[PDB]
Design an enzyme around this catalytic site. Structure first.
Site, mmCIF file in Angstrom:
data_model
loop_
_atom_site.group_PDB
_atom_site.id
_atom_site.type_symbol
_atom_site.label_atom_id
_atom_site.label_comp_id
_atom_site.label_asym_id
_atom_site.label_seq_id
_atom_site.Cartn_x
_atom_site.Cartn_y
_atom_site.Cartn_z
ATOM 1 N N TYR A 138 -47.357 16.899 13.543
ATOM 2 C CA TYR A 138 -48.141 15.400 12.675
ATOM 3 C C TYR A 138 -49.301 15.471 13.242
ATOM 4 O O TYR A 138 -50.081 15.209 14.545
ATOM 5 C CB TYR A 138 -47.336 14.144 12.768
ATOM 6 C CG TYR A 138 -47.210 13.830 14.063
ATOM 7 C CD1 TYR A 138 -45.938 14.181 14.912
ATOM 8 C CD2 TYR A 138 -48.074 12.987 14.498
ATOM 9 C CE1 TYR A 138 -46.389 12.888 15.833
ATOM 10 C CE2 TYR A 138 -48.307 11.643 15.726
ATOM 11 C CZ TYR A 138 -47.084 12.078 16.189
ATOM 12 O OH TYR A 138 -47.258 11.731 17.982
ATOM 13 N N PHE A 176 -57.269 9.921 15.009
ATOM 14 C CA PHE A 176 -55.876 10.654 15.258
ATOM 15 C C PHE A 176 -55.402 10.214 16.219
ATOM 16 O O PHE A 176 -55.988 10.776 17.314
ATOM 17 C CB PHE A 176 -55.832 12.269 14.608
ATOM 18 C CG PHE A 176 -56.076 12.117 13.067
ATOM 19 C CD1 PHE A 176 -54.840 11.548 11.996
ATOM 20 C CD2 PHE A 176 -57.570 12.784 12.739
ATOM 21 C CE1 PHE A 176 -55.369 11.618 10.910
ATOM 22 C CE2 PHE A 176 -57.724 12.181 11.089
ATOM 23 C CZ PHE A 176 -56.586 12.297 10.357
ATOM 24 N N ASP A 177 -53.696 10.006 16.281
ATOM 25 C CA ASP A 177 -52.934 10.469 17.572
ATOM 26 C C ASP A 177 -52.411 12.102 16.598
ATOM 27 O O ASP A 177 -51.991 12.224 15.966
ATOM 28 C CB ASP A 177 -51.203 9.536 17.137
ATOM 29 C CG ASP A 177 -50.796 9.877 18.138
ATOM 30 O OD1 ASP A 177 -50.554 10.471 19.088
ATOM 31 O OD2 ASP A 177 -49.568 10.018 17.534
ATOM 32 N N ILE A 217 -39.413 5.270 12.820
ATOM 33 C CA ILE A 217 -40.431 4.754 11.706
ATOM 34 C C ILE A 217 -39.297 5.074 10.576
ATOM 35 O O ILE A 217 -39.231 6.065 10.195
ATOM 36 C CB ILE A 217 -41.668 4.583 11.088
ATOM 37 C CG1 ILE A 217 -42.262 5.511 10.596
ATOM 38 C CG2 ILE A 217 -42.238 3.297 12.541
ATOM 39 C CD1 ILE A 217 -43.719 5.313 10.633
ATOM 40 N N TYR A 247 -44.259 -0.472 10.864
ATOM 41 C CA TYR A 247 -44.542 -1.594 12.025
ATOM 42 C C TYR A 247 -44.135 -2.658 11.570
ATOM 43 O O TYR A 247 -43.848 -3.547 12.277
ATOM 44 C CB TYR A 247 -45.405 -1.225 13.608
ATOM 45 C CG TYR A 247 -44.711 0.277 13.996
ATOM 46 C CD1 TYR A 247 -43.719 0.357 14.584
ATOM 47 C CD2 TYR A 247 -45.629 1.302 13.193
ATOM 48 C CE1 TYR A 247 -44.232 1.779 15.488
ATOM 49 C CE2 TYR A 247 -45.751 2.640 14.009
ATOM 50 C CZ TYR A 247 -45.008 2.529 14.267
ATOM 51 O OH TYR A 247 -44.436 4.175 15.189
ATOM 52 N N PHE A 255 -50.117 10.235 7.757
ATOM 53 C CA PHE A 255 -49.890 10.929 8.963
ATOM 54 C C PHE A 255 -49.891 12.488 7.298
ATOM 55 O O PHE A 255 -50.210 12.219 6.262
ATOM 56 C CB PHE A 255 -48.429 10.749 9.110
ATOM 57 C CG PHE A 255 -47.503 9.904 10.189
ATOM 58 C CD1 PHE A 255 -47.611 8.348 9.552
ATOM 59 C CD2 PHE A 255 -48.007 10.415 11.505
ATOM 60 C CE1 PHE A 255 -47.328 7.759 10.754
ATOM 61 C CE2 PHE A 255 -47.253 9.186 12.131
ATOM 62 C CZ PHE A 255 -46.943 8.167 11.507
HETATM 63 C C1 LIG Z 1 -45.103 2.853 18.406
HETATM 64 O O1 LIG Z 1 -45.677 4.069 19.660
HETATM 65 C C2 LIG Z 1 -46.240 5.299 19.491
HETATM 66 C C3 LIG Z 1 -46.352 5.775 17.683
HETATM 67 C C4 LIG Z 1 -47.073 6.662 17.839
HETATM 68 C C5 LIG Z 1 -47.804 7.414 18.597
HETATM 69 C C6 LIG Z 1 -47.229 6.936 20.374
HETATM 70 O O2 LIG Z 1 -47.724 8.711 21.078
HETATM 71 C C7 LIG Z 1 -48.279 9.251 21.050
HETATM 72 C C8 LIG Z 1 -46.529 6.265 20.554
HETATM 73 O O3 LIG Z 1 -46.089 5.876 21.492
HETATM 74 C C9 LIG Z 1 -45.196 5.598 21.824
HETATM 75 C C10 LIG Z 1 -44.970 7.323 22.589
HETATM 76 C C11 LIG Z 1 -44.593 8.390 21.586
HETATM 77 N N1 LIG Z 1 -42.854 8.168 20.441
HETATM 78 C C12 LIG Z 1 -43.138 7.562 19.588
HETATM 79 C C13 LIG Z 1 -41.773 7.270 19.155
HETATM 80 N N2 LIG Z 1 -40.822 8.458 20.102
HETATM 81 N N3 LIG Z 1 -42.241 8.099 20.939
HETATM 82 C C14 LIG Z 1 -41.784 6.929 17.791
HETATM 83 C C15 LIG Z 1 -42.247 5.665 16.638
HETATM 84 O O4 LIG Z 1 -43.733 6.350 16.502
HETATM 85 C C16 LIG Z 1 -43.341 6.664 14.885
HETATM 86 O O5 LIG Z 1 -41.815 6.343 14.646
HETATM 87 C C17 LIG Z 1 -44.173 7.785 14.359
HETATM 88 C C18 LIG Z 1 -43.548 9.007 13.414
HETATM 89 C C19 LIG Z 1 -43.456 9.637 14.515
HETATM 90 C C20 LIG Z 1 -44.294 10.357 15.338
HETATM 91 C C21 LIG Z 1 -45.629 8.887 16.142
HETATM 92 N N4 LIG Z 1 -45.629 7.920 15.512
HETATM 93 C C22 LIG Z 1 -46.332 6.637 15.393
HETATM 94 O O6 LIG Z 1 -46.433 6.233 14.884
HETATM 95 C C23 LIG Z 1 -47.634 6.862 16.200
HETATM 96 C C24 LIG Z 1 -48.482 6.819 16.101
HETATM 97 C C25 LIG Z 1 -49.412 6.418 14.205
HETATM 98 C C26 LIG Z 1 -50.569 6.142 14.176
HETATM 99 C C27 LIG Z 1 -51.779 5.894 15.064
HETATM 100 C C28 LIG Z 1 -51.149 5.271 16.159
HETATM 101 C C29 LIG Z 1 -49.930 6.330 16.886
#
Ligand SMILES: COc1cc2cc(OC)c1OCCCn1cc(nn1)CCOC(=O)[C@@H]1CCCCN1C(=O)[C@H]2C1CCCCC1
Length: 128
Positions: free
Chosen positions: A45, A55-56, A75, A101, A118
């Site tokens: 992703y 981007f992350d 999420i 969030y 995403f």
């Molecule tokens: C809120 O914390 C993060 C969110 C995201 C990236 C992060 O680190 C790379 C984050 O740090 C936490 C450690 C990695 N992580 C996330 C999750 N489980 N482990 C689930 C919560 O995240 C999600 O459900 C979603 C979908 C799955 C991939 C990560 N993700 C995110 O929301 C990213 C954010 C995307 C938008 C820009 C900032 C990061």
């Protein structure tokens, strides 16, 4: 760019039809089988705040992101979105804060009331 294109052209895949999760298929996959709730799911992703450039990326960590579908390890928009995807599919999602969030956000990465974008590739999934 991509976020605006999802706003304009994406399908509403929410139950409530509140445009909370919008999707475009960017590359068609194969299966006629999506992952089911409880499945172990493997993705790559790229993710960003919809207004925001940086981007992350799973690529940055040099391995796929792995999670169990429909268990709230991600999420709500991911549990909804990835359940619609086939193996090998690449999809774009644009997500209102209610499916991400919310009002609290998740600082420092995500602020209050953030819309997220995403690109997700479904690499694989295995039954529990
Ligand atoms: C809120 O914390 C993060 C969110 C995201 C990236 C992060 O680190 C790379 C984050 O740090 C936490 C450690 C990695 N992580 C996330 C999750 N489980 N482990 C689930 C919560 O995240 C999600 O459900 C979603 C979908 C799955 C991939 C990560 N993700 C995110 O929301 C990213 C954010 C995307 C938008 C820009 C900032 C990061």
């Amino acid at each position: 760019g991509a976020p605006a294109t999802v706003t304009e052209q994406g399908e509403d895949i929410t139950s409530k039809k509140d445009r909370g999760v919008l999707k475009i298929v960017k590359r068609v996959g194969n299966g006629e089988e999506t992952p089911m709730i409880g499945d172990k799911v493997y993705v790559h992703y790229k993710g960003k705040l919809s207004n925001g450039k940086k981007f992350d990326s799973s690529h940055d960590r040099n391995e796929p992101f792995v999670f169990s579908l429909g268990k709230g390890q991600v999420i709500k928009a991911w549990d909804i979105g990835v359940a619609t995807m086939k193996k090998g599919e690449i999809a774009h999602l644009l997500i209102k804060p209610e499916y991400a969030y919310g009002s609290a956000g998740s600082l420092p990465k995500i602020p209050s009331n953030a819309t997220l974008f995403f690109e997700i590739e479904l690499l694989d999934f295995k039954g529990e």
